[PDB]
């Protein structure tokens, strides 16, 4: 395939939804409700543009029940992204805003589907780079849908032919090696596994990590230095021991000790049976 570009006059941009780490989302129309994210890199370079096109080509061939569909892009008004529009609230809204009260069965199931989708993404060698409860939607309250995966070329504006990842996004899910931004490519499968570990912390504690640290830059420095770690004491009492042990494995400071998603997905399913 090739030209995944959407012309002008085909996208009915609607109410402004909100801005995130690398774009501002509007609810547009395009053969049905869609999510139009106006990228921050509105003026892209021809080298950055072609890299963005290549990555769009890899994201379009993704199809999984736990993955938000990637429908292409547009560049008429400004560079934007067109993705499947999701009903209901995100996982972040359920856990930390709406304070929905799930049962441990449903919580572990949400962790399973999330690992399911993540396992599919890594199966196609796709690094999410921004895994968090904000990018996990519960379509119809039942199924899980991961969004805002990939898109490394639209994150970290380029200079001409370089893309030095200027660390952006929410810091709570960033792995230490990502925080430091020191060795070549910090974003790896294990960096996603770490973020997944922080999502597990969300599910098993109902809190965001570092509930006693209200300094953004203090968390950045201490987490990057290996001084700060999510306090696992905050895990609910009804949480399975095996789940807690898996969470601790995903949050290992040294990324080489974190498991991959095939093993993670197996551990979650095993402890879901013995329940």
């Amino acid at each position: 395939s090739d030209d995944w570009e959407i012309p002008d006059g085909q996208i009915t941009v609607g109410q402004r939804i909100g801005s995130g780490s690398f774009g501002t989302v509007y609810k547009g129309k395009w053969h049905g409700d869609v999510a139009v994210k106006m990228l921050n890199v509105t003026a892209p370079t021809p080298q950055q543009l072609q890299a963005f096109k290549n990555e769009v080509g890899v994201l379009r061939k993704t199809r999984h029940v736990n993955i938000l569909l990637f429908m292409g892009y547009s560049t008429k008004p400004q560079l934007a992204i067109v993705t499947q529009w999701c009903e209901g609230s995100s996982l972040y809204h359920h856990l930390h805003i709406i304070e929905t009260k799930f049962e441990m069965i449903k919580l572990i199931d949400i962790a399973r589907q999330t690992a399911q989708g993540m396992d599919y993404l890594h199966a196609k060698s796709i690094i999410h780079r921004d895994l968090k409860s904000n990018n996990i939607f519960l379509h119809e309250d039942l199924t899980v849908k991961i969004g805002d995966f990939g898109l490394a070329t639209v994150k970290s504006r380029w200079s001409g032919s370089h893309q030095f990842e200027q660390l952006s996004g929410s810091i709570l899910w960033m792995a230490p090696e990502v925080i430091r931004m020191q060795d070549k490519n910090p974003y790896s499968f294990q960096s996603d596994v770490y973020a997944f570990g922080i999502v597990l912390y969300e599910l098993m504690t109902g809190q965001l990590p570092y509930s006693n640290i209200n300094n953004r830059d203090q968390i950045i420095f201490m987490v990057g230095r290996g001084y700060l770690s999510p306090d696992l004491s905050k895990v609910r009492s009804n949480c399975p021991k095996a789940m807690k042990r898996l969470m601790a494995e995903c949050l290992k400071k040294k990324r080489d000790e974190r498991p991959l998603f095939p093993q993670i997905l197996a551990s979650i399913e095993l402890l879901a049976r013995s329940l």
Partner: protein
């Protein structure tokens, strides 16, 4: 003095003309600025014709916490000093916390810095006096501390005033803010990066760092190059690490007076206890001198911006 007492009593008078603050009573004039946190518009309160600055913080927080933030914000009614931006009222509507304050037609010293490139030492002396007195009023009269001193939070106006703004008064608002995207630079003191606030001294560090930046016209972490200095993209984690494990920044030796250099040097001592406190800075040689100088700040500001 007297002119300050006039203006303070005049602000309270105009503030009493403002009753309940509703989203409909505001008409949007022009945008003033924005940044990792919210956005600020210049607005007109139709029930009283008053022109105010309205900051809009969009936080995705549970309502219980949001209600506590609004309640905590009402302390700002007690902050009435010529070095603190006037506060009209804070409320919540359409999913955004709105905090309405007095309009400063000069803007933040961040914008003034860009329009000016560098700010003269004579002017930074007046700015230092204002910041020192502002922090003092917050420390003594309210036992609250800024916790976010930087050029973007020092406001100025055509009447020559220099006021503090965006200072930490709502604990819950700080916690909710803690879940934000990483910035590009930090004025945080080293003890706060490794620990917690150490009294007003931690704010004095940020004041010093802001002075160095405004004096040279460039964020001083890392320090300028050898020939970048005679010419008068570091990672965020490397900046925080440089502030913690590297010697503090300083001013060029030949451009600025010794009193000023020693002033910022005592403000940037990495150990918070050895660092100078408000009591020491108030009677420092640089502040003593800059207080006797008759500098026309309002004229300089309106010239730098382009007003008459």
């Amino acid at each position: 003095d007297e002119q300050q007492r006039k203006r303070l009593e005049a602000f309270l008078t105009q503030k009493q003309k403002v009753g309940e603050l509703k989203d409909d009573d505001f008409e949007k004039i022009s945008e003033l600025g924005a940044g990792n946190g919210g956005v600020v518009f210049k607005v007109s309160h139709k029930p009283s014709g008053l022109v105010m600055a309205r900051k809009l913080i969009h936080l995705e927080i549970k309502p219980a916490i949001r209600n506590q933030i609004i309640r905590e914000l009402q302390v700002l009614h007690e902050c009435n000093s010529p070095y603190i931006v006037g506060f009209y009222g804070a409320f919540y509507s359409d999913g955004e916390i709105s905090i309405c304050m007095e309009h400063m037609d000069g803007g933040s010293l961040d914008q003034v810095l860009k329009k000016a490139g560098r700010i003269p030492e004579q002017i930074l002396g007046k700015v230092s006096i204002a910041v020192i007195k502002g922090l003092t009023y917050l420390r003594e009269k309210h036992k609250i501390m800024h916790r976010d001193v930087k050029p973007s939070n020092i406001l100025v106006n055509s009447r020559g005033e220099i006021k503090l703004c965006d200072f930490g008064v709502s604990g819950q608002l700080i916690d909710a803010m803690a879940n934000a995207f990483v910035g590009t630079r930090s004025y945080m003191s080293p003890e706060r990066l490794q620990g917690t606030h150490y009294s007003v001294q931690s704010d004095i560090w940020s004041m010093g760092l802001s002075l160095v930046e405004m004096a040279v016209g460039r964020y001083p972490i890392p320090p300028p190059d050898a020939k970048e200095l005679e010419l008068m993209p570091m990672a965020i984690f490397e900046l925080l690490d440089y502030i913690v494990n590297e010697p503090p920044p300083k001013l060029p030796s030949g451009v600025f007076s010794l009193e000023f250099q020693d002033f910022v040097n005592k403000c940037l001592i990495k150990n918070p206890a050895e660092r100078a406190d408000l009591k020491q800075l108030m009677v420092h040689a640089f502040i003593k001198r800059s207080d006797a100088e008759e500098v026309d700040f309002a004229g300089w500001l309106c010239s730098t911006i382009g007003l008459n």
